[PDB]
Amino acid sequence: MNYFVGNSLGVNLTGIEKAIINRLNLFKEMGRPAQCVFLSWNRYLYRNAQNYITSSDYINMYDFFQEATYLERNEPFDWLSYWTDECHYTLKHVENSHDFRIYDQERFLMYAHFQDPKYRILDYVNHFDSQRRKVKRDFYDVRGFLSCSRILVDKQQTLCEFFYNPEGDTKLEKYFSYKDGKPEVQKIIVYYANKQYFFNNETELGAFFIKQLYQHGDLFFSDRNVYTAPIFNLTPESIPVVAVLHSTHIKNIDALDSSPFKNVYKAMFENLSRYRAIIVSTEQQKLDVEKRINHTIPVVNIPVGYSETIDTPVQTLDQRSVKLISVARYSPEKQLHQQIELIKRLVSYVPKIELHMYGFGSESKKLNELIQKYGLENHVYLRGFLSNLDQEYSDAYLSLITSNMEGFSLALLESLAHGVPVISYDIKYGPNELITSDFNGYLITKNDEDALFDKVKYVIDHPEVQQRLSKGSLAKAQQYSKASLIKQWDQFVRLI
Amino acid sequence: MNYFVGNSLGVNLTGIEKAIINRLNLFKEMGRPAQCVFLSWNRYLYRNAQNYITSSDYINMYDFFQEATYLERNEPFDWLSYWTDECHYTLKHVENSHDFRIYDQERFLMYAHFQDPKYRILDYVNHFDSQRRKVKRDFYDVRGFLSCSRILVDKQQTLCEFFYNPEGDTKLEKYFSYKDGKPEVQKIIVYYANKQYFFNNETELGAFFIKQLYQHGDLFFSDRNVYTAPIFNLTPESIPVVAVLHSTHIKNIDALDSSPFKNVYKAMFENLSRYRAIIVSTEQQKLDVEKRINHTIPVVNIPVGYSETTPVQTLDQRSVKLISVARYSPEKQLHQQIELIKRLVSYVPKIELHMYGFGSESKKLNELIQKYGLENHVYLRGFLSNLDQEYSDAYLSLITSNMEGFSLALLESLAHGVPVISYDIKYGPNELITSDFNGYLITKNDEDALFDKVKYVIDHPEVQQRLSKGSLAKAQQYSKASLIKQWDQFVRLI
């Protein structure tokens, strides 16, 4: 059995999350057992996983100990008619919210919070004593059951939390003490195997959990090396783990030798004999990493993404309009303001031009402030993150990358697969490998926005080029075919 | 020859403008000659019309007297260099514009303005005197020639206008005086037929033109009645004309008998004996009109739009996409849809509203999308011409106006498989939707009932598909083949 350890799955999948799911779906078709391992406590991971993996494709560490691994949504529960009818409480609704303030004949007891406006998903319930101190907080799983009560001290500070199984029995206790104005774990009690276990640390908890999962002949893959690498350090070398690096390994990629390893990858690079091999996406990163490592341990390049059969429309280009697209999380590294800029000085040459920006991150409001400032309301669109962008690649003329650091770009390959050429700064890793300028898009010089504007403008001018590039896009998309990676993954696993 | 008579075509086609082109394409297929007439001076008309009808398909009255009827673009002319290389002027380019100031050795002469940044289309040239007053503006046709010079007075006020043919010769003159604070024609001179004609307003010119155009057994349709009815009224009964009505005919739809006509239509109704008939779109409007006019003249219903044979109903599971194909004008009540989405976003976090159109409320509507934080959900997509791919992942169409004839936007939805949820307004929705067949009719302005239904259909994808299948069915009742029959019928019998 092959385990791909990560942290968790977001509402919106991140690059690492998407990459993990891809490995899982390749291993599915290949015929090898595989499973995702998630470490982070997350009561919404069932909902978050549902449109991508099945509850048997994944083990979550907390679920495991909560005897709630492979548990489904149970039947919905009318909490409000419980409180009114059964409990003879009265329910003052809080305005502009799915919240409530529960009372028993003018005694304030708890503050209820739901996720949804149908009031079917209870999120949390907060408990108050005689003097309206917030004493205890009950958090609920998205499948129904009460998952964790938390006990508060002083200024709603976390003193400890208790994790339960869906039947209610306690399975986990965590004790907090406040260092630097923030709760740090200091004790963990785990009820497991009809015994009691003690750990000082969530890492020590992580290691224990692995040792349970592990059988002889099982193989691990460490994908959030921030957390997963410390966990594996406290694991016997007898247990094979292969590191998977999900981005550029160093703080400045221009200083190949005189540059520190990233805070996230430091723990792996310190214990490099722990890991059976290390996997990057780009050949360049394979070369770069094994020189800096000094070939102490093998390195392989297996790309995080692959190209699949296209049974939606490709290059159905309305000859009157020009859709440009960004498919990138709205974070600073992606440098999306440069694209709003580009669209600014480009409407006058191509009016009726559109830029659709697919993502959602933190820069949402900063990005929206510019499309508004420059008058670009009817030309630039902040389309929220959505999967199955296949319909959304159909009318796309070009893809833009203006990030500065990317590693393998899943959205880059996804463009090429839909026949949409991409114009991207010439950065590491990824674009260099996936784009050949004047083959399937163009590589632009870093942050050289005038060079950017020129080629984007040139390509909008001569559609004969877009069609030529769009062709070779499909060509390049094929070198990363699902078969190329099933085999490439099968060969890697056998060698190990 | 059948002549459909409107004002002109805009950069974004209006409902009537779309209708005149639809009628043309219909006649063109069925083989009866027809061609659009446009009245107002519009020096971008040939560019506006490039995608919809030929230059053989249309006669603009200014083009006609300007002897530029059926004229096409010239070879490019390099004005920038001509002013430099041949007129030894300097060009002080104006910042953030396609404009130059034109000097002759520190003497400020002209302010040029180009449309495009490629400087290939000269738009207008402003002329200044020795004191730097703007005395003359030179308006250029997008085909390259000088169409009109306007002489200014006082506070850049329009005093008279001269209209040329492409050779340069002068063909019309208009003299203005200011009523309120706007210019108003008071004299028109026309050099046509090697003679001089005098008219007192643009209406009398319009009537003079018609008679120039008219030949025995030509037939005319009046499609912009605020302007065209006054024209045909100054025209002899011997010229056949048929009124065509494009909105509700009455200031208030609720008093069928009592209320006044819309200002647009007063001129028409007050002289109903001049028109061989009225065309309307919906069977209902045919009746309501007939009652009021006491069957004085024939009323006939011939829908403004037809359906025809591109991906359809390729619905992504995770996202719900709502569409409004409607102008950003106030009587479409498009703010109500932003309010809808605002309520509906916490039940449907993946929802979108794409709002296709142009219009005066682009700013009111933009502010609300900003105020409510719906910038990631409601989009002002602005006017798009071919919408065939936007309809593909459309879940439903939305209508929230209060006044409509046939909705061409509604039928287009139904044609592309997209059910419509509309208020129960006259005319059009009553006729094209059958609730729980291809969409729902809502009590007018019942924004709760609207929300209730929109959320419902979203809740039941299986209903949506049932509704989509009925929308395709109803659309084939308004087919192309059938409307060519309706036109050929109701031309032959007039």
Residue numbers in the entry:
A (entry chain A): 1 to 496
B (entry chain B): 1 to 309, 312 to 496
Pull text from the paper:
Despite the biological significance of these two glycosyltransferases involved in pathogenicity and avoidance of the host innate immune response, their structures and the molecular basis of their activity have not been investigated. This study reports the crystal structures of SdgB and SdgA from S. aureus as well as multiple structures of SdgB in complex with its substrates (for example UDP, N-acetylglucosamine or SDR peptides), products (glycosylated SDR peptides) or phosphate ions. Altogether, the extensive snapshots of SdgB complexes in multiple states provided a mechanistic insight into how SdgB recognizes and glycosylates the clustered serine residues in the SDR proteins.
Two glycosyltransferases (GTases), SdgB and SdgA, are responsible for the glycosylation of S. aureus SDR proteins such as ClfA and ClfB. The subsequent addition of GlcNAc to the glycoproteins is catalyzed by the second enzyme, SdgA, yielding glycosylated SDR proteins in which each SD repeat is decorated with GlcNAc disaccharide moieties. The glycosylation of SDR proteins mediated by SdgA and SdgB protects SDR proteins from degradation by host proteases, thereby circumventing innate immune attack.
